[PDB]
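hiii so my PI (J.) wants the whole complex modelled not just the main chain, which honestly fair. so below is everything: four entries, each one labled with what it is. i double checked the lines twice but i was tired so who knows lol
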Amino acid sequence: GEMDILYQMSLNHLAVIEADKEVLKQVGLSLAKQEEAFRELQLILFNHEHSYSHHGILGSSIEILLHWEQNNVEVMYLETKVALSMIDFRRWLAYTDLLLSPILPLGTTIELNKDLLPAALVTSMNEIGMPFLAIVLGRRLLLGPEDREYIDYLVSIYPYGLRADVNPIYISNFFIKKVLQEGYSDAIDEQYIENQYRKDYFSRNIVSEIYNVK
Amino acid sequence: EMDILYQMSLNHLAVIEADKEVLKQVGLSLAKQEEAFRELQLILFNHEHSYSHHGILGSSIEILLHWEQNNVEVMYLETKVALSMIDFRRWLAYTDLLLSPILPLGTTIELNKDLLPAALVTSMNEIGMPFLAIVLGRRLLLGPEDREYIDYLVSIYPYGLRADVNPIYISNFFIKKVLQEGYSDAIDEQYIENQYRKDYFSRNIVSEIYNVK
Amino acid sequence: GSTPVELLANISNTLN
Amino acid sequence: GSTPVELLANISNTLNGFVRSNISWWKKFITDSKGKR
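here's the output for the full assembly
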């Protein structure tokens, strides 16, 4: 498809050889279509954890070590170990995320991860039994005014929805804990997503703000 | 739960007890039938003079609207309820408030282009853009101490909400069809009953389409 | 150029 | 009174504080559209 050409082109810029570019391509294609596995790596990056592992038979085992002290990352995939810098590790993931990660439909209802809130906010929601649920209002919004990065979703807390007296919320994908129910989608949405949120953003080198491509 | 609350709202009407009871049975039937109730709202907005449906009991519900006379005739079980236009709007407003279903958040709807921007419909037709929208908010109050709500707050699909694409305030009769309902659970059911029905009843807050004052 | 911002802002300006 | 507006505002303001983008476009739309109708 079109995304495969664009994806291999985003791998040319990494300071690595063509042997490792093919390996990173296969790892990215495999992790991106497995949505639960890719979010686990994002949370590992967010917490600066040290290790990621999503092993399996038939040559599906993937292990990633993040050596935060030496700004090094080791991506092992079928006895082929790929080394690259931490900044190149984030660029690889950012363009994997831009071009290959599924985008949730509008109106999707999700449960967010309370482990990412300040304690005073958690204890306030717990007092009244408010679970951390939300609905997708918008997707991959451009951060103004420079418009050099996007953020994955704009949401409102469920069941209150969008209100006049409360702001919509910008959040990243790693805030999501589970999808309760996806919203409506069809061929119009798939074409719009591919054009506006993948191809047009790739052309302007707009990626998700969490990978912090400076 | 809500049956005795609906009976209370019929005390806002200047009709006899027998007429209140007839209006109760008509409203219990219409609000259960989402498409039938929306058809009546659309007949109201168009100022048509006749409405014809069949209650769940089977008896036909006949409504005659005399706009220059500012009164209405509701016919059910051979009973003719004569009421003013304002009592008609109040009856329907509390029927809607207390009994009409509320679409889940995230529901996808098709908007009737007639009730939408008149000539701008041509603009989205030029690009083949269908009139699909996502429910983002429900029974919205724009500010404090507002005595009326807006049925739904929606964003055009597939663009959604963004800083440069404002959402749209719509009434339930803006909906041509519901394409896919969003997620709902007990949390939503409890919040809908408490905030959008019981609390709005206590404050005399009904849909703005009825324009009671 | 995949989002017609001006037409979408016009739909909302009118109905609101 | 059945909606915890204050807590909902605190959640939005806290999470939006993590993002380098302005959210004030929302309240501008709200307070403007209320006066038009």
